[PDB]
């Protein structure tokens, strides 16, 4: 038997074609990805090959304005259009809560959405029962393939699943389901899931009976030979794991953002054992035409997008000053507004009052001379990187060193200068780098009345960073390797727009949070 696994992972609502770096498509003649282009390629493969199985490893929710406006309706609609055979729940599927997953995706998808390690509790148990399955036996050709899915144990920390969901160990939850498939006369089993490449290899080695592992959550690129784009492979495609039972299990990933379509041919024998496997991720560049019908549907749905983008989120009395000459050299209105948005979004970690933000994240200003109108387009211009604001736990010494790094190379107009909120920092550029932070006060937590007290090096603090800061971006290496706890949060533009819509008239000011001697 011969099976063709087509798979995608970590698409992140990349419905339209994107650039080479998966950003907004400027030059349409050199743009990759898209659900129309993916539809064209999948249609070609399905017309050419008898046994095809298009699988999704999750993280199809979130990433662009499509999810902001349609909140998962677009994802379910276009996976029904592309006719996915199965999906595994990613962490981002719980970003809008469990209610934001049940209604737009679980109740609207025409394919099984799977996770064997998510267990519901109490009131949610009856509401979500039957919406997601632990496994599914899909008939492919004349055979049956058992697909069992899994999700990260870190979903409670990376997302908002609720208090009624338990994410247990992937191995000890997949093994009973694989055995159940075995007693159901299914000998070809695919472990589809969203837990990262390392856990995919662990599942391949440990779970007995798994033939192929299709994963996500890691943005891992596997290629055999010379890669067709800027991605650097982390291993051969497929990555062959020698399981404890003596079998060679292929593990496959297809990078992210819909740029690639993983294509793996597996030849089975009569008993369901993988005789061999080979393939590659197909790069979806402009050489693959976009399907006219799916493109027309995207154009129809992309009107509501442009209608929502233009609408007014709120009024601004003041000039927001997102200019690079201000956000990278001194305190700016925009950094204070962004920090306030983070703090208010978190508080409304229930007592977190600290915020740092790299000035390289602020790209464009917002003009109040245009009748004081703020739109989604302006905020998207300010923060076009599509990141999220995450809660982290730091030490006083780590924050102090981060603030030294913030001004360790002042004058070069770099983006490491930090806008702060709930932090009063006074620098002194005259002294040598590494000691230029003369004064550093933070808002006290776990206290009746908040006040700005000097930062204690031996103490522990909770700070809202961007993903760039929490992952060693613009420098700040001492932050990424010293976080005690790190939990992902809400989107950047979403948080700022929510804060602006809550405060119908905003008037940020340079409050003296950052000072120079």
């Amino acid at each position: 038997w011969e099976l063709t696994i087509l798979h995608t992972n970590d698409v992140h609502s990349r419905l339209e074609q994107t650039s080479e770096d998966s950003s907004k498509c400027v030059n349409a003649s050199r743009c990759m990805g898209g659900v129309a282009r993916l539809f064209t390629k999948v249609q070609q493969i399905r017309r050419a090959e008898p046994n095809v199985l298009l699988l999704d490893a999750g993280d199809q929710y979130q990433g662009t304005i499509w999810f902001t406006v349609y909140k998962g309706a677009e994802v379910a609609h276009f996976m029904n259009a592309l006719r996915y055979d199965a999906m595994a729940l990613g962490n981002h599927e719980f970003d809008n809560g469990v209610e934001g997953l049940i209604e737009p995706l679980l109740k609207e998808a025409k394919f099984p959405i799977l996770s064997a390690n998510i267990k519901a509790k109490g009131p949610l148990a009856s509401q979500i029962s039957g919406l997601y399955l632990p496994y599914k036996v899909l008939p492919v050709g004349d055979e049956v393939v058992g697909i069992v899915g899994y999700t990260s144990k870190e979903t409670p920390f990376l997302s908002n699943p609720g208090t009624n969901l338990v994410f247990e160990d992937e191995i000890t939850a997949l093994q009973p389901e694989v055995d159940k498939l075995k007693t159901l006369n299914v000998n070809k089993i695919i472990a589809l899931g969203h837990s990262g490449f390392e856990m995919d290899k662990l599942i391949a080695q440990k779970v007995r009976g798994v033939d192929v592992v299709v994963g996500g959550h890691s943005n891992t690129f596997l290629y055999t030979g010379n890669p067709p784009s800027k991605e650097v492979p982390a291993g051969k495609y497929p990555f062959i794991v020698t399981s404890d039972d003596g079998r060679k299990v292929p593990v496959v990933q297809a990078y992210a953002f819909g740029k690639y379509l993983g294509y793996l041919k597996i030849e089975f024998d009569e008993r369901g054992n993988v005789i061999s496997s080979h393939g590659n991720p197909i790069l979806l560049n402009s050489s693959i035409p976009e399907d006219p019908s799916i493109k027309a549907d995207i154009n129809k749905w992309r009107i509501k997008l442009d209608n929502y983008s233009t609408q007014e989120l709120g009024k601004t009395i003041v000039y927001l000053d997102g200019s690079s000459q201000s956000c990278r050299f001194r305190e700016c209105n925009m950094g204070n507004l962004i920090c306030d948005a983070m703090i208010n979004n978190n508080l409304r970690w229930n007592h977190v009052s600290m915020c740092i933000l790299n000035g390289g994240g602020i790209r464009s200003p917002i003009d109040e001379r245009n009748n004081g109108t703020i739109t989604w387009e302006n905020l998207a211009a300010v923060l076009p990187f599509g990141g999220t604001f995450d809660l982290v736990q730091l030490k006083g010494s780590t924050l102090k060193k981060a603030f030294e790094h913030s001004v360790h190379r002042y004058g070069q107009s770099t983006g490491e200068f930090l806008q702060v909120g709930g932090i009063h920092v006074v620098y002194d550029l005259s002294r040598k780098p590494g000691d230029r932070v003369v004064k550093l006060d933070v808002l006290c937590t776990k206290c009746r009345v908040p006040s700005y007290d000097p930062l204690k090096m031996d103490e522990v603090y909770k700070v809202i960073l961007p993903n760039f800061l929490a992952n060693g971006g613009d420098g700040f290496q001492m932050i990424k390797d010293e976080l005690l706890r790190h939990d992902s949060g809400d989107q950047d533009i979403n948080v700022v727009s929510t804060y602006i819509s809550k405060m119908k008239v905003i008037y940020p000011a340079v409050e003296g949070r950052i000072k120079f001697s």
Epitope: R46, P50, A81, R83, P139, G141, D142, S293
Partner: antibody, heavy 123, light 108 residues
């Protein structure tokens, strides 16, 4: 969402011809094999004809072979059944049905059926 | 043409009674069998598309089984909504013949 609408059925004199049409919506018409299925009043289902996505493989029942002609226009998302040399045995409700399989190489039955169009071949 | 036989022509059943319908092919059709349910005046609804694969939205009380020449449809804990006509259909190759049908009607 997936919807099939028949049309063109009606009263036919014996020995005459009639072209049934089926408009498809809510799915990629050029991805699925399409079938015409009879049901005479009071009797069960009878498979009339079937066409592949690219019209490369066409099948007829032995009772309609040499008389009926199935065809499809993927540009207009339409299915056509030209019935020729009709007789009283073809009086039935005709359904256009969409094959469940998205693979041209297999048949998984028919998962989407139309409302049916009644053809009454009687003098 | 692969002639297809279905037994019984009609079966009497009450609510909660297990119902078994057997479909037998002329030649081996591997596991390419479909089971449909038709109410009076309504289009047929696909219940089983492989020999045992359930269509989405179909209750788990419907089960398919069998392979090769003999196939079986089982309705455990029959419900009032299941009193209809049931058809088998071989999906091996053109022509795609249907079975005779089996009417499941309320026993009294």
């Amino acid at each position: 969402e997936v919807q099939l609408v028949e049309s063109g059925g009606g009263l036919v004199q014996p020995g005459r011809s009639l072209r049934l049409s089926c408009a498809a919506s809510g799915f990629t018409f050029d991805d699925f094999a399409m079938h015409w299925v009879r049901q005479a009043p009071g009797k069960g289902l009878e498979w009339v004809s079937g066409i592949s996505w690219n019209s490369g493989n066409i099948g007829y029942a032995d009772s309609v072979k040499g008389r009926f002609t199935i065809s499809r226009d993927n540009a207009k998302n339409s299915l056509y059944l030209q019935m020729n040399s009709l007789r009283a045995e073809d009086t039935a409700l005709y359904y256009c049905a969409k094959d469940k399989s998205g693979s041209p190489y297999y048949y998984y039955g028919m998962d989407v059926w139309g409302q049916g169009t009644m053809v009454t071949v009687s003098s | 043409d692969i002639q297809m036989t279905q037994s019984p022509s009609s079966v009497s059943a009450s609510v909660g009674d297990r119902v078994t319908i057997t479909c037998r092919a002329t030649q081996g059709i591997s596991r390419r069998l479909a089971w449909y349910q038709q109410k009076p005046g309504k289009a047929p609804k696909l219940l089983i598309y492989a020999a045992s694969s359930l269509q989405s939205g179909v209750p788990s009380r419907f089960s398919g089984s069998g392979s090769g020449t003999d196939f079986t449809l089982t309705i455990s804990s029959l419900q009032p909504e299941d009193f209809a006509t049931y058809y088998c259909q071989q999906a091996n190759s053109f022509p795609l013949t249907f079975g005779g049908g089996t009417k499941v009607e309320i026993k009294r």
